[PDB]
Each structure stands twice: as structure tokens, then as C-alpha cells.
Symmetry: D3
Subunit: 151 residues, 6 copies
């Protein structure tokens, strides 16, 4: 109810490889906040192109990870932990604002997502927060996403 592992994440989020960017959830408060993280390793395909000989986890993917964290929070806050309801849902990005990248994320980093709900109404959730590595803010972002039934 407050801590979830990759198996639980796979039953809630529709995202899959190579776009499931959340490995574990450490803190979860319904309608309120979520703390999760994704391990960053060299053994990830994106590193073949970003950049050759200089592995830098793409900033936009950090945003994606925060969004997915927000989505997990949004879903469980809505229907609780229900894989059956979740398997036919998808998530759409509506907006992204105030994104600032301060420190590059590289292989070996534990990218921690901290997101708080700024406002939600039905299926539309607007979250905002930071991504941290070893306690330091590596990025900050604000985004609004919509959960939608697969049509």
C-alpha cells in the first residue's frame, strides 16, 4: 500500500520495455505524493545513441519517469491496486511546464522521483516535483497527464 516492486508496477502501468521507466516505489500517499526510482545502468539501449562514448540519461526520459510515477499514483488513488481495471487503461501527456535540468544523470545513478499532486479532477492529474540522485536535485518538472480507457 506504500511500497511496490516491479511486479506490482507491471500490473498497474501500461508502459512496457523500452518505455517502462520506474523500477520501484518506496513511498505512496493516495491523492498526495509518491516517491519512486529507476536505476540507471550502462546496459540500457538508449545509451548507444545518447551519447556514443559519453552516456547521459536523456532529460526527456527523466520527465517520462516522473510522469509514470505520477500515473501510478493517479491510478491507485482512483481504483486502488486493481490490475484488472488497469490492464485496459493508457496514459496521455497533456502538458509539461517548468522543467529544469541541473545535473546530468549517468550509469550508476539511482534516479529517485518525488512527485506531489498539485491538482487532479477525475482522470486529469497534474503533478510536479523533482528527480534526485544521492539526495541532490537533478531535475525539476511539472506535468499534467490523463488516464484514458483503451478505445
Amino acid at each position: 500500500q506504500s511500497q511496490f516492486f516491479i511486479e506490482h508496477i507491471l500490473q498497474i502501468l501500461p508502459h512496457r520495455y523500452p518505455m517502462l521507466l520506474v523500477d520501484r516505489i518506496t513511498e505512496l500517499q493516495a491523492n498526495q505524493k509518491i516517491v519512486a526510482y529507476k536505476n540507471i545502468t550502462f546496459n540500457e539501449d538508449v545509451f548507444n545513441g545518447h551519447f556514443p562514448n559519453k552516456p547521459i540519461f536523456p532529460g526527456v526520459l527523466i520527465v517520462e519517469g516522473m510522469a509514470q510515477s505520477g500515473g501510478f499514483l493517479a491510478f491507485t488513488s482512483l481504483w486502488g491496486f486493481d490490475p484488472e481495471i488497469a490492464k485496459t487503461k493508457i496514459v496521455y501527456f497533456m502538458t509539461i511546464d517548468k522543467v529544469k535540468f541541473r545535473i546530468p544523470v549517468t550509469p550508476g545513478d539511482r534516479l529517485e522521483y518525488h512527485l506531489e499532486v498539485l491538482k487532479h479532477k477525475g482522470m486529469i492529474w497534474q503533478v510536479g516535483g523533482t528527480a534526485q540522485v544521492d539526495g541532490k536535485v537533478v531535475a525539476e518538472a511539472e506535468l499534467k497527464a490523463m488516464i484514458a480507457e483503451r478505445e
Copy 2:
């Protein structure tokens, strides 16, 4: 004013599977740039976004816009110079005012329209839209920095 994939490759450091611009159709130094990327089902990203429902990631649309803006920045600074380019990389600094209006899917020709908002040194702030068949599919503003590897 047409730059093809082999030209883009000589300027941008990005490579597979993060090189998201296939061709440059228009270029005007310190002003604007129009480019595009073809979207096909035969892209690994679609295996997971989403299964049975291919939607080109909104964040990758923004990445493509950033890269387009990057090409504009590189050439505006040093002209088409492969030698200088090979020592640089690019970092995302900020992203703002992005809105997605229509989902981009396999079969779409994703066209990037970026104009220079402000710039100085290696720091470039551009903004514009992403379009499919003449309709705005997304809006975005972003600031990136060019740097030595």
C-alpha cells in the same frame, strides 16, 4: 536548403535509438528551422508505448524538436562544420509551455517548426510546434546548451 540524414549525422552527436530527425527542409540562421522525422511501426519504442496501441512518446516529440533546434544552433554558430561538431554534445537545460493536442502514430510525418527566441554563446532558447499534415500536434519551448564532449 535540404540537409539529409548523412548531413544531420555530421552535425548532431545523437545516434540510434535517440537520433530523432530524419531530414531538414528549411534553415535560416538565427531565425528558424523546419524539419521532420518519419514515424513507422518498425521502431523499438513502440514495443512498449503502448502494446497493441502505438503512440509516439510525447517526450520524444519534444526531443525531436530540441534536436531540430540543436541543428539550427550548431549551424548558426559555426556553419556546416563537421570538424567542430564532432567534439560537441548537447544538454537540455529547460522545457516549458508544452501542450500535446493530437497523438502521433505510425504513418505520420512529424514535422518540427522551431524559431530562435533568444541565444548567447552555447545557450539556445527556441520554441515552436510539431505538426502532422498541417495541424499542430504539439507546442513547446526549450533551452539547450552546446558543450565540448
Copy 3:
């Protein structure tokens, strides 16, 4: 008469990285089909064909025409029937008169134009060309047999 990736996924058994048709623009039962696949640098195939010079494989151009031709033969007899589609398998027996005239590269919209040359029972012979912006880049003739999966 226009089918999108979602529809194609329901008729063809092909999946990544071998589903080479992104969208169907037109189709006349027992007569012809026009379909296409977008070519983008963001495709795994370009890693090896070739390094520093991306050229869409000619055999894959032919594979794309085949898939289009199969979609044609299938829908002509059964229409858009996902259920029946799973009970059937369209495989190719022969390929002839293949000619490559122009290389296909990232940024190109590879259009498949096939017409039914002849058909008898489950044996369907299709032929046509592959076009990029109105010009013929390849041509070929193929014969397929439709069988129970």
C-alpha cells in the same frame, strides 16, 4: 478503404521488427492496393545497412510489397475480419521480375502499389512497384498461397 496501423495489426501476423506496412491508403477488392511505410533513421536495420550510410534493404522493400499484397488477397476474400485472419496464413511461393532503380533512405515515404495480376482459388499473383514521391524505386511480381494457420 483507409486502414491504419491498428487495423493492420489485426489482419497481418507480422510484428516488430518485421511488420513493414504502416498504413493503407486505398484498396479495391480483387484489383489493387496502395499502402506505405515510413522510413526513418530510428530503425534497427540501419545499424548494419549500412554503418555511416543508411539504405533501406531492397529485400525488405519486396517484403513490404508482399505484406501489402497479402493484405489485399486476404481482405478481397474475407474483408476486415480479425477473427478469420487468425485461422489463415498467407505465405509467398515465388517472387520474380524484381528490379531496384533508386535507393530508399530515412525520410522517404515508401509507397507500395500492387494489383492482382491473376488469382485462382487460394493462389494469388500480385505485382506492381514501390514508389517514393511519385517515382518508381522498385518493381516486383509475387505469388502467394492462402492456407489454414
Copy 4:
């Protein structure tokens, strides 16, 4: 200069993963013929999509393999094992005729290419032959290739 292993093939053909479809060359006679093969294993990305639950090596890739074999033959017939010149040349299909797929190719099969030189004048090479598995013809084809400049 009748047997060549992957290290030698890599020095002659420009093809790389996932389009280098020749693993070894067992017989080679200048201007006359070549015998080579490609091992087929389930551990190949193509099988993820061709097809799910039913691994079948794409017929067009069988043709591609015959062509690469033919190209190696054409090049070495003209310049011998010359890696430096190989990287300045490239072979392209001009045409493909009389392709017949007789038996499906699947993981565990050793796809053996048998190409014979039907006609050659300068950079223009016409070859034809078969693809075999355990002595049986699984496919046949003819093709005309062009040895062109890389730049």
C-alpha cells in the same frame, strides 16, 4: 583462400548487425562459385515478429543471404582477399528473378548458400543458386549485382 570465417567476412562485406547474414564460407572458387552458410537460432531479433509463437526465417532474408554470398564471391574473384579495397566498394542488387521458397527455415537450421556464377563482365555479376538445409533445397534464386563505389 577457399575457407573464410566471420572475421574474414567482416573485412570484406560492409554489412553489420542486424543485416550481416553470412557466418562462414566453406567453398570458394574464383569466378565460378561459393558455398557459405548462416546458422539460424531462436536468439535473433527477427523472430520476435516473424512470427510470435511460430519462428520462421524470412524468405527475403534467405535471398539477402544468397546475395551477400554472391557479393563476397564477386569481390574476391576480382581483388582477392583485399580488405583495404573492400571498404571502398559496395555491392547492390540490380535485379532478382525466379525466387522459389520450398521449405520453411527455422531455429536450429544451418542455412547453406550455394551460388554459381552465371555471367560476369567487370563490376556486373550475375549469380544464381539455392539455399539448402540438411541437403534439401529450401529456396532458389537468381540475381544480378553491381559492384559500385562507396562514395
Copy 5:
């Protein structure tokens, strides 16, 4: 006594890129198994092991032997039962006495020879060699456990 990839897929839980057994050529319940995996350049592993010098990772050879053992272990206890197989996975418990004598490269037919040293319930202990053209390229002993998925 022989099983093809279609059969293996139905028994072992491994999938791409970790199903490293292609065909079973010999099987004696609770005693031994001979199988093999074709090695080809067209495998992703080779992109990193190593550039311009493809060598099939020694640890993957052991993995292949384990998988063969797992196939032996399961068919010995349930025969060819796809329904009960999909409810299990295999867990590596120990590895011992492995020696790598000859490098394995593209074009090689990696043959697995395993015999059960001991077995008790879901716990199976096998040992043997990996052969290429009749020569031992590797040796190993390992203990695995079949567990409820």
C-alpha cells in the same frame, strides 16, 4: 525423443534474448539430454562481446547447458505438459567445475551434453560438456530448481 523450437517454447519459460537452446536431439527421462543452439553473427550479444571479435560469452554457454538440463528435468517429471510448464520457472542454485577450453564463434553449432548427477523433487543436479564438431569447448556442473511461478 527429439523436440523442436516450437516444443521448447512450450516447456521452458525463457524467451528472447535468453532462450539459448534451439533443438533437442536426444532425451532419456531422468538420465541425459543432448541438445544444441546455433551460434550466428546475427545475435545482439555480439555487438558487445566483442567489437570486431565475436565470441559467444562463456557464461551463456553454461546458461544453455542449464536450460537443457531444465528441459530434461521438467519432461522427466511431467512429460510434455505445456499447461503445467507455464506455471513454473527455473532457478540457478549453484555452478561448479566449469572450464572454458575453446572459444565459441559464429558458425558454430553449440552442442549441449548433460547427464543428471542427482535429482530430488524440483531439485536437479546435472553435469556435462558443450561440444562443437565433436570437441569439448566447455565443461560444467550445475544445480537448478523448478519453482512455482
Copy 6:
């Protein structure tokens, strides 16, 4: 001298994607021991097949990661951080012994390799140790390698 990041590992080991299984080196004592680690994330191709709906880092890859760490230890003991000499060397692993798996490794785990030189005779190096996640031993292993000219 004691801390190496991915850029440094890339200049010493020949391994590349998808077989470079060491992300960072936290500590190194020439001729004695090495502590390093590889983050485990779901966004790795191997998890597509090991296993579907049940991601478990392959036990053999933990052993491979340990071997890589040993090789970096051996190499750096001999010539220190030297990319140029690194390109002319290779270390093949001859044997692997006494490996035991105690706890499965999964996405979200920080797989920490702990290797120590058990014996160094000529071109032969024997290393051994454990793989740990959050202080617990998840795997043990002994391995022998040989240093040779590329």
C-alpha cells in the same frame, strides 16, 4: 586511483552493450580487492526473456559481472589506468568455481561485486568473492583468468 566511473571502465574493458555489466568502481586496492557495482533496471533487454512477467537478473550474468570486475582489478594492478595498453590486452576466464546463488536479483537492485585476489601466479589470476545487494550476499563465486596479448 580508487574511484572510476563508466567513462573510465569503457577505456579499460573491451566489453560493450549489451555485455558491459559494471557501471562504477567504488574502491580498488592494487593486487588485493575491488568493490564495484551495476545497477539493475527493468529497462534492460534481458528482462524481455528472463522472465516474462517475472524479471530476474540472470545468475550467470552476476558471475559475468564479477568476472569483469576481477579483470579490471587484474589489469589495473598490472598497469594502472592505461587505456592505450588496455587495447593490447585480453583476459580470458579459464574456470569458474563454487558459485552459489542465495537471493534473486531484480529491477531496482544495486548489484555490488566484491572481489579479492586469491592467487596471482604469472599470467594467471584467481579471484573470488561475492555479489551483494543492500549488505546481503546474493551470490558467491571463484574464477581464474589469464592475461594475454590481444
